[PDB]
Design a protein around this ligand. Sequence first.
Ligand SMILES: CCCCCCCCCCCCCCCCCC(=O)OC[C@H](COP(=O)([O-])OCC(O)COP(=O)([O-])OC[C@@H](COC(=O)CCCCCCCCCCCCCCCCC)OC(=O)CCCCCCCCCCCCCCCCC)OC(=O)CCCCCCCCCCCCCCCCC
Ligand SMILES: CCCCCCCCCCCCCCCCCC(=O)OC[C@H](COP(=O)([O-])OCC(O)COP(=O)([O-])OC[C@@H](COC(=O)CCCCCCCCCCCCCCCCC)OC(=O)CCCCCCCCCCCCCCCCC)OC(=O)CCCCCCCCCCCCCCCCC
Ligand SMILES: CCCCCCCCCCCCCCCCCC(=O)OC[C@H](COP(=O)([O-])OCC(O)COP(=O)([O-])OC[C@@H](COC(=O)CCCCCCCCCCCCCCCCC)OC(=O)CCCCCCCCCCCCCCCCC)OC(=O)CCCCCCCCCCCCCCCCC
Ligand code: HEC
Ligand code: HEM
Ligand code: HEM
Ligand code: HEM
Ligand code: HEM
Ligand SMILES: COc1cc2[nH]c(C)c(-c3ccc(Oc4ccc(OC(F)(F)F)cc4)cc3)c(=O)c2cc1Cl
Ligand SMILES: COc1cc2[nH]c(C)c(-c3ccc(Oc4ccc(OC(F)(F)F)cc4)cc3)c(=O)c2cc1Cl
Ligand SMILES: O=C1C(O)=C([C@H]2CC[C@H](c3ccc(Cl)cc3)CC2)C(=O)c2ccccc21
Ligand SMILES: O=C1C(O)=C([C@H]2CC[C@H](c3ccc(Cl)cc3)CC2)C(=O)c2ccccc21
Lengths: 192, 49, 96, 96, 360, 360, 243
Amino acid sequence: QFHREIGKLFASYSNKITANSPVQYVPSPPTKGKVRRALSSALMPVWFKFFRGPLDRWNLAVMAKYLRDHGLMYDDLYSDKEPVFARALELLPPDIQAARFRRLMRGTYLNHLRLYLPVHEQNYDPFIPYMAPYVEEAKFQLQEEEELLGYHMWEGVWYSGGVTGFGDKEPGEHFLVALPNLYGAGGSPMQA
Amino acid sequence: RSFLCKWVHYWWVSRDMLAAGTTEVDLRPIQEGMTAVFKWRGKPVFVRH
Amino acid sequence: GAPKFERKMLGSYPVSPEFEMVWRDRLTAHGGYIQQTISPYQLKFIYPFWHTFFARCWCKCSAYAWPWVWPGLITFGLVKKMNHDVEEDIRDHYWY
Amino acid sequence: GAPKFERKMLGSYPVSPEFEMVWRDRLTAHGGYIQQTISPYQLKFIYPFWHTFFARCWCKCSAYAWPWVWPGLITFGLVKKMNHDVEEDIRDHYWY
Amino acid sequence: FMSLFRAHLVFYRCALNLNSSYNFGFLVAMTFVLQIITGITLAFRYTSEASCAFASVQHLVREVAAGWEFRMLHATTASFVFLCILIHMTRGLYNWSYSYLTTAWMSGLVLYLLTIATAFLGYVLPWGQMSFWGATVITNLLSPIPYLVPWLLGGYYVSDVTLKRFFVLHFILPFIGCIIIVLHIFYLHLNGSSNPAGIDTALKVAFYPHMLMTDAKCLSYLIGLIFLQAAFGLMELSHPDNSIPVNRFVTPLHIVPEWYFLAYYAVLKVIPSKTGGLLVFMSSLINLGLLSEIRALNTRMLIRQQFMTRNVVSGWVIIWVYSMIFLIIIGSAIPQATYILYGRLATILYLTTGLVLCLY
Amino acid sequence: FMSLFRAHLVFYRCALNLNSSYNFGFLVAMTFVLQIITGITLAFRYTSEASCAFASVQHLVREVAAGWEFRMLHATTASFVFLCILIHMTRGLYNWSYSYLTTAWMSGLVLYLLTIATAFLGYVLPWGQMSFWGATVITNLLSPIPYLVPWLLGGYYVSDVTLKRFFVLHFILPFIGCIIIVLHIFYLHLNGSSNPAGIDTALKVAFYPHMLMTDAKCLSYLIGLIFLQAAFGLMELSHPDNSIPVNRFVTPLHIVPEWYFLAYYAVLKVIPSKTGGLLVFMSSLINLGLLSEIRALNTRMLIRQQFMTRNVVSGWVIIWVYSMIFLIIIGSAIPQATYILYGRLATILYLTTGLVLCLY
Amino acid sequence: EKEPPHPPSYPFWFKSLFHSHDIPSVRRGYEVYRKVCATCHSMEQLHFRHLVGEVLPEKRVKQIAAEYDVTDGPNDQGEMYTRPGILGDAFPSPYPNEEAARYANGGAYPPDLSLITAARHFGPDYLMALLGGYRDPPEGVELRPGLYWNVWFPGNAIAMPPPLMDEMIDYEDGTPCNISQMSKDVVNFLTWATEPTADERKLYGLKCVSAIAIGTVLMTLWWRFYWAMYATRRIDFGKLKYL
Ligand SMILES: CCCCCCCCCCCCCCCCCC(=O)OC[C@H](COP(=O)([O-])OCC(O)COP(=O)([O-])OC[C@@H](COC(=O)CCCCCCCCCCCCCCCCC)OC(=O)CCCCCCCCCCCCCCCCC)OC(=O)CCCCCCCCCCCCCCCCC
Ligand SMILES: CCCCCCCCCCCCCCCCCC(=O)OC[C@H](COP(=O)([O-])OCC(O)COP(=O)([O-])OC[C@@H](COC(=O)CCCCCCCCCCCCCCCCC)OC(=O)CCCCCCCCCCCCCCCCC)OC(=O)CCCCCCCCCCCCCCCCC
Ligand SMILES: CCCCCCCCCCCCCCCCCC(=O)OC[C@H](COP(=O)([O-])OCC(O)COP(=O)([O-])OC[C@@H](COC(=O)CCCCCCCCCCCCCCCCC)OC(=O)CCCCCCCCCCCCCCCCC)OC(=O)CCCCCCCCCCCCCCCCC
Ligand code: HEC
Ligand code: HEM
Ligand code: HEM
Ligand code: HEM
Ligand code: HEM
Ligand SMILES: COc1cc2[nH]c(C)c(-c3ccc(Oc4ccc(OC(F)(F)F)cc4)cc3)c(=O)c2cc1Cl
Ligand SMILES: COc1cc2[nH]c(C)c(-c3ccc(Oc4ccc(OC(F)(F)F)cc4)cc3)c(=O)c2cc1Cl
Ligand SMILES: O=C1C(O)=C([C@H]2CC[C@H](c3ccc(Cl)cc3)CC2)C(=O)c2ccccc21
Ligand SMILES: O=C1C(O)=C([C@H]2CC[C@H](c3ccc(Cl)cc3)CC2)C(=O)c2ccccc21
C-alpha cells in the first residue's frame, strides 16, 4: 500500500521536528557561517572607512533630498496593491489617513510642475515610521488565515460564477473569464 | 487625400506597358476563301480574302 | 483597481457600462477638499510655460547628472582606449 | 427573447454569466405541470425507433406528396419535351 | 471567453423538435474552417506568376508527399460549401425565417456574396484556359464605368499583376467572412431560432446533450462524403478544360462553368441586352434583400405557417427551386434556339416567383 | 463595442503627471498599423520565386507609380518599431513596472519575440546576398536537433520553397501580434498604469482632453521623422550589400546585420562554444521573464522608487543600456583580438547587470 | 583582413538636400559609359524608355537605340533573328552568360552596374576615389600578371585594368576631356541610373516635411491649450485661501 507507506515516512519526519520544539523564546542562529563572520571582522577597518561608510551615507542623502523636494514621508512610498499594507490602511485612524491623502496629492502636483519647494518647507525628518503599529497587526491577521485555511490545495468547480475555479474570489480578473455578457447593460460586483 | 491618391494610383498600369505600336502585313500568300489571323495591340485581327 | 474598502460606493444607481473604468478606481476624499479651475479660453497658455522655464530646466538637468552622464563619460573613455589599443595592434602585427 | 412580462423572475439571486441565454428566454408555466423521465441507462433506445417506423414514415411521405412530387413530375415532363424539340430541330436545320 | 462558450454552446436552450434541417449552418461553418486549413497549407507551395503558376500546381501533385490530398480536398470541399449554403437558404425561405430574423437574413445575404467572390477569385489561380477566359468574361461584364476595368485588372488585359492581386484577395476575404459570421450569430441569438412548426413553445431543452450529438452525427456523414468523392472521383464536378495551358488568342471550343455558377451563366445566354443581363442579378438580389421587412408591406398580421404540407398549390419556394434547377440544366447545354426558348420560359418563372413572395 | 471604446479611451482616468515617456506604447501600435497597410500594398506586386524575387522588388521602384514610396516607408518604419520598443522597455525597467504589472510584462516579452521573428522573416524576402547568408547562419544556429533544419528549410539548403513559406509566415505573424496586443491591454487596464513618481495618488484626470493631445503631438513628430528619413536618406540604416544578387558559393567580404540585431551578432563573435552562444540568449530572456514575480524573491516589502535621481551609484538599468550600446559598437566592427577582448568585458557586464536585478 | 580606408567627400552637385541631378554631366557620363565602360559591364535593368524627357530628347534616343542589333523571335519557321533596337528594349550586354564573362576577364566577374552606387560604401565618393586609385606597387609586394595595384580597392589588388585615358572619348557640348572630368561625369551618370526617381522623391519630400512641421507647431499649441488649465489649478484643504 504505497500511499500509507509514504504517509509513514512523512509522519516520522514530522514527529522528529515536533520533538525538538522549545517551550519559550530562544535567539535565532546567526545568518552567516563562522568563516564569513571571521573574514568580515578582519576586513572591517578598511571596508567600512573607504567603501561601506560613504555608500550608506550618500544613500540617505539622496533619499532625504528627493523626499523633501516633494514633501513626502518615507512610508508614503508603499502601495495599496500590497495586501498587508491594504489591511494596514484599513486599520488607520482618521487624522493619519487624511494627512497621507493630502501629502500624496501635493506630491503628484509638484512632480507634475517639476518645481522645488522653498528650503523652509523642507525642514522635517522624512523617515519617521508612522505605519509600523498597523503593519505588524496586518501581518498577524493575514498569517493566521494562511495557517487556518490555506494549508491545502482545495478543489473546486471550474469556470463557474465568473471565477476560474482554481482559487479566485473576484469575478473576471483573468482573461479566460473576460467579457461576462453579450447583451444588456452589464453591472458591477460591488452592487450585488 | 494625398495618401489615398497615391495608394489608388499604385494599382494603375505600369510605365513599361504603354500599349503603343504599329505593324504591317504582306498579302501575297493568301488564298480565296481563307481567313488569316494576326496580332495587334494585344488583340487578334482577322484578314479574309 | 482599488482596495475593496475604497471602491465601495455611497450611491446605489446602476453604473453605466461606459463608466466601468471610472468606478473600478474609486477612492475616498479623506477630509474633503476645495478646487478652482478657469476655462482655458480665459487663460494665457504659452507665457506660463516660458515664465517657469529656468526652474523646470534646472530641476530636470540637476536630477540626471550623476545617473546618466558620469557612466556615459566612462563609456566614452573606454571607447577611446579601445581605439588606441587597436591602432597599436594593427602596426605591431603587420608592419615590419 | 421573451416579452418583458414573461422574463420577470420570482427570485432575486444574481444570474451568473454562463446562464445568460437561459434567463433571457424565461417563460411562465401557466397552470403548472408534472413530468417524469427515465435515465437512458435504463431504457431501450433502438427498438422504440423501429417500433414506430411505419407510422412516422406514412406521416412524412403523406405530407410531401403534392407539394414536392407533382411539380417535380411536371418539370421532368418539360425536360423530356425540350429534348424532343431539340432532336427534331437538329434534323430540320441541317439534314437534307 | 469560456463563460461565453458555456452560455451559447452548452446551456443554450432550443426547441425539442429541431430536426436535421437545422444542422446545416454548423456544417457550412465547418467547411469554412476546413477550407481555411487546406488553403493555408496550399499557399506554402503555390507560385503566383503567369509564366509558371500552372506547373506550380502540378508540382504539388507530382513531387510532394501527400501533395495530391490537400489540393483535392480543397477542390471538393468548395462544392459542399455551396450545396450546404443552398440547403440552408431554402430552409429559411420554406419557413419564412426572415419574418423576425431580419438582420440575420441580411447578414446571410452578405455572407453569400462574400462566398461567391471568394470562390471566383480562387477559380482563377490554377491558371488554365477556363480560368483566363472566365476572368476575361467577368471583367468585361462590369465594364459600364470607364477605366475601372483596366484599373482592377492592373493592365489592359488579364495579366500576372492580375494573378498576384487575385491571390492576395483570395487570401484575405475568408477571414472577413469569419468576422461577419460572428456578427451573424450575434443577430441570431439575439432573437432565438424558429421551429419547423412555426409556433412559440415552452417545451425547450438544452443544447449540449441532445442537439450537439446530432450536429456530430451529420458532421461524420459530411466528412465521409467529402473523402469518398475526393479519393475516388465519383462525379465530374469540374470540367476537364482547366487542364490545358492558357492561350490568349484561342478560346476553348466548349464552355461549362463550375456547377454553382451555371444558373447565372444561363441568364447571360438568353437575355439579349447585356445590361439587362446584369440588371437581372441586381434585381433578384434586391428582391431577396426586400424580404427582411415583409411585415411592413401589409397590414394583415403575419404567421409563419405556410401550410405547404398536403397542399396541391405547393409554394413559391418550391417553384423557385425547380426553376433554378431547370436553369442549371439549360446552362449546361450548347447555345441553340430551343434551349434559349425554354431558357426564357424558365427565366420568367424564376423572376416572377421571386417577386411574388411579398404579396401575402 | 462603442461603449467599450468610451470606457477605455475617453473616460479612462490617468494620473496628472504622466509625461511623454508614457506615450511610446501608442506609438509602437501606430507603427504596427502603418506597417500593416504598407505590407498589404507591397504584397500585391511581390514575386515569391528565387529566380526572380529580386527583380520583382526592383520593378516596384522603377516602373510603378509611387512604387518607391511604399517600399521605403516599409523599410524605414521597421527601425522606428524597434527604437520605440526599446524606449518602451527601458522605461519600465527604470520604473520597476513589473512589480505589479506582472502579466503585462510577460505579454510584452512575448510581443517582442513575435516582433523579432517577423522582422527577420521580412529581411529574407528581397533575396540578396545578405538575405541568403543570414538565413543560412540563423538556420545553422538552431541545428542541435536532427532533421529539424532541413524540415524547416524545406530542403537541404535555402531554397525557393524556403522563400515561399517565409513569405506566408511573414504575412501571418503580424495579425497574431494584434491579437496579443489586445491581451496585453487587458492585463494592463486590469491594474492601471504607474506614475513616474511611483506613488499611489487620487489626483487623477480623464484621458480624452489632456492625454489624447499629447499622444497626437508625439504622433505628429514621429510621422514627420519617418518621412524625413524615408524621402531624403539621412542615415545609412541598412548596409549596401543586400543590393547584390545571391551567390550560393561566395560570401560577402564584409558583414553587418541591421542595427537592431547587432548586439546579438556581437555575442556570436566573442563566445567560443556555439552552444554557449545560444544559451546566452536563452538565459538572458529567462532572466527578464523572472522579473515578473520579483516580490516573491525576498521578504522585505517592496517599493517602486529606485532613487536614481542625483545618485552617484546610478542604476543597473543604465549600466545595462550602456553595455548594450557598447555591444552594438563592437558588433559593427571587424573580428580582431582587441575588439573581442573588450567584447568579452562588455558581455560579462551585460550578463551580470541583468542577473543582479533580482537581489534587492 | 583589414579595415579599408574611407574616401574623401567630393562636392557633387546632388548631395545637397535641395539640389537635383546635373543633367549635362549625366549626358556626358552616358556618352563615356557607351564608349568605354560598356565594353565589359552590363546594366540589365535599364531600357531606352528611361532616357526620353529625363536626360535626352526622344528623337535622339530612338537614333541611339537603332545602332544595336537585338535578337527576337521565333518567326513563322520557329527560327530566331536580329532586328534594329527600339525604344522599348533593354541595354545590350557584352557576354551571353557569367561563365563567358569570367572566361574573357581572367576569372573575375564584372558586376552589373544597375545599382552600383547603392551597392558600395560611400557610393559615388568611393567610385570617384577608385577610378583615381591606380598606382605602382610598394616595396616588398609584387602582383601576378593580369592584376593591378589600386590604393582604394579593398586589399589593394584589383583585376580591372587602369580605366581612363585622356581624349579617349569626346564630348558634344564642347567640354575638354581628361580622366578627372570623365570620372566626375560617369559617376554622375551612374548615380542617376541607380535611382532615376531621385528628384521626384526629394521634391515631394520637401513639401511633405514642411507641411508636417507646420502641423507640429499647431498641435503643440493645441496641447498646451489644455495643459494650462490643470497646471494652474488650485486645490485647498479645510478652508478657502484665495479667490
Ligand atoms: C484553456 C484551458 C482549458 C479549460 C480547462 C482548464 C485546463 C486546465 C487543466 C489542467 C490542470 C490539472 C491539474 C489540477 C490541479 C488541481 C489542484 C487543486 O486542488 O486546485 C487548487 C490549486 C490552487 O490552489 P492553492 O494551492 O490554494 O493555490 C496556491 C498556488 O497554487 C501556489 O501553490 P504553491 O506555491 O504552494 O505551489 C504548489 C505547486 C507545487 O508544485 C510545483 O510548483 C512544481 C513545480 C515543478 C516544475 C515542473 C512544472 C510543473 C507544472 C507541470 C506542467 C505539466 C502539464 C502539461 C503536460 C503537457 C502534456 C502534453 O503545486 C503544483 O504545481 C501542483 C499542480 C501542478 C499541475 C500543473 C499541470 C496540470 C496539467 C495536467 C494535464 C496536462 C495535459 C495538458 C495537455 C497539453 C495542453 C496544455 O490549483 C492549482 O494549483 C492549479 C494547477 C493547474 C494549473 C492551472 C490550470 C490552467 C488553467 C488556465 C488555462 C491555460 C491554458 C493556455 C492555453 C490557451 C490556448 C489558446
Ligand atoms: C434522406 C435525406 C438526406 C439529405 C441529404 C441532403 C444533401 C446533403 C449534401 C451535403 C452533404 C451533407 C452531409 C449530411 C447530410 C445529412 C445527413 C442526415 O442527418 O440526414 C438525416 C436524414 C433525414 O433526417 P430528418 O430528421 O428526417 O430530417 C428532417 C426532414 O428534412 C424533414 O424536415 P421538415 O419536415 O421539417 O421539412 C422542412 C423542409 C425544409 O426545406 C428544405 O430543407 C428543402 C431543401 C431542398 C434542397 C434545396 C437546395 C437544392 C440546390 C440544388 C442542388 C443540386 C444538386 C444536384 C445533384 C445531382 C446528383 C445526381 O424540408 C423538407 O420539406 C424536406 C422534404 C423534401 C421531400 C422531397 C421528396 C422527393 C422524393 C423523390 C423520389 C425519387 C424517386 C426516384 C425513383 C426512381 C426510379 C427509377 O435521415 C437520413 O439520412 C437517415 C440515414 C440514412 C442512412 C442510409 C445509409 C445506407 C447505406 C447503404 C449502403 C449499401 C452498400 C451495399 C453493398 C453491397 C455489397 C454486396
Ligand atoms: C528631447 C528628448 C527627445 C526624445 C526623443 C527620443 C527618440 C525617439 C525616436 C523615435 C521617434 C519618436 C518620435 C517622438 C519623440 C518624442 C517627442 C516628444 O514629445 O518629446 C518630448 C520631449 C521631452 O518631453 P518631457 O515631457 O520632458 O519627457 C519626460 C522626460 O523624458 C523625463 O522623464 P522622467 O523624468 O519621468 O524620467 C523617466 C526616465 C525613463 O527612462 C527612459 O525613458 C530612458 C530611455 C533611454 C533610451 C533607452 C533605449 C536606447 C536604445 C538604443 C538606441 C540606439 C540609437 C542610436 C542612434 C544613433 C544616432 C547618431 O527617463 C529619463 O530618465 C530620461 C532622461 C535622460 C537623460 C539623458 C541625458 C543625456 C545628456 C546628453 C548630453 C549630450 C551633450 C553633447 C555635447 C556635444 C559637444 C560637441 O520634449 C521635446 O522634445 C520638446 C520639443 C523640442 C523641439 C525642438 C525642435 C527644434 C528644431 C530646430 C530646427 C532648426 C533649423 C535651422 C535652420 C536654419 C536656416 C538658416
Ligand atoms: C574591361 C576592360 C572593363 C572595363 C572597360 C571596365 N571594367 Fe569595371 N571591372 C572589370 C573587371 C574584370 C572587374 C573585377 C575586378 C575584381 O577585382 O574582381 C571590374 C570591377 C569593377 C568595379 C568593382 C569595384 C569593387 O570595389 O568591387 C567597379 C565599381 C567598376 N569595375 C567600375 C567600372 C567603371 C565605372 C567603368 C567605366 C569607367 C569600368 N568599370 C570599365 C572590367 C572592366
Ligand atoms: C471559404 C473559404 C474558401 C473557399 C470557398 C475557397 C475556394 C477555392 C476554390 C474553389 C479554389 C479552386 C481550386 C481548384 O480549382 O482546383 C481555390 C483554390 C485555392 N485557394 Fe481557396 N478557398 C477558400 C479559402 C482559402 C484560404 C483561406 C486560402 C489561403 C489562406 C486559400 C488559398 C487557395 C489557394 C492557394 C488555391 C490554389 C489551389 C491550386 O492552385 O491548386 N483558399 N479556393
Ligand atoms: C458562411 C455562411 C453561413 C453560416 C456559417 C451560417 C451559420 C448559421 C448557423 C450556425 C445558424 C444556426 C443553426 C442553423 O440554423 O444551422 C444559422 C441560422 C440561420 N441562418 Fe445562417 N449561416 C450562413 C449563411 C446564411 C445565409 C446565406 C442565410 C440567408 C440567405 C442565412 C440565414 C439564416 C437564418 C434565417 C437562420 C435562422 C433560421 C431560423 O432560426 O429559423 N445564413 N446560420
Ligand atoms: C509589425 C509588422 C511588420 C514588420 C516589423 C515588418 C518588417 C519588415 C521588414 C524589416 C522588411 C524588410 C524590407 C527591406 O529589407 O527592404 C519587410 C518586408 C516585407 N514585408 Fe513586412 N513587416 C511587417 C508587416 C507586414 C505585413 C502585415 C505584410 C503583408 C501582409 C508584410 C509584407 C512584406 C513584404 C511583401 C515585404 C517585402 C518588401 C520587399 O520585397 O521590398 N509585412 N517587412
Ligand atoms: C507591439 C508591442 C507593444 C505594444 C503595442 C504596447 C502597448 C502598450 C500601451 C499602449 C501601453 C499603455 C500606454 C503606454 O505605456 O505607452 C503599454 C504599457 C506597458 N507595456 Fe507595452 N507595448 C508593447 C510592448 C511591450 C513590451 C516589449 C513590454 C516589456 C518588455 C511592455 C510592457 C509594458 C508595461 C510594463 C506597461 C505599463 C507600465 C506602467 O504602467 O508603469 N510592453 N504598452
Ligand atoms: C440544430 O439547432 C441549432 C444548432 C446550432 N448549432 C450551432 C453550431 C450554433 C452556434 C454556432 C456558433 C456559436 O458561437 C460562435 C460564433 C462564431 C464563431 O466563429 C466561427 F467563425 F464560427 F468560428 C464561433 C462560435 C454558438 C452557437 C447554434 O446556435 C445552433 C442553434 C440551433 Cl437552434
Ligand atoms: C500617456 O499615458 C497613457 C497612454 C495611453 N495610450 C493608449 C493608446 C491607451 C490605450 C490603448 C489601447 C486601448 O484599447 C485598444 C486595445 C487594443 C487595440 O487593438 C489594436 F491592435 F491596438 F488596434 C485597440 C485598442 C485603450 C487604451 C492607454 O491605455 C494609455 C494609458 C496611459 Cl496611462
Ligand atoms: O462565358 C463565360 C461566362 O459567362 C462565365 C460567367 C459565369 C457566371 C459568373 C458569375 C455571375 C454572377 C455572379 Cl453574382 C457571380 C459569378 C461570371 C462568369 C464563366 O464563368 C466563364 C468561364 C470560362 C469561359 C467562359 C465563361
Ligand atoms: O553571421 C551572420 C550572423 O551572425 C547573423 C545573425 C545576427 C543575429 C540574429 C538573431 C539572433 C538572436 C535573435 Cl533572438 C534573433 C536574431 C541571427 C543572425 C546575421 O544576421 C547575418 C546576416 C548575413 C550574413 C551573416 C550573418
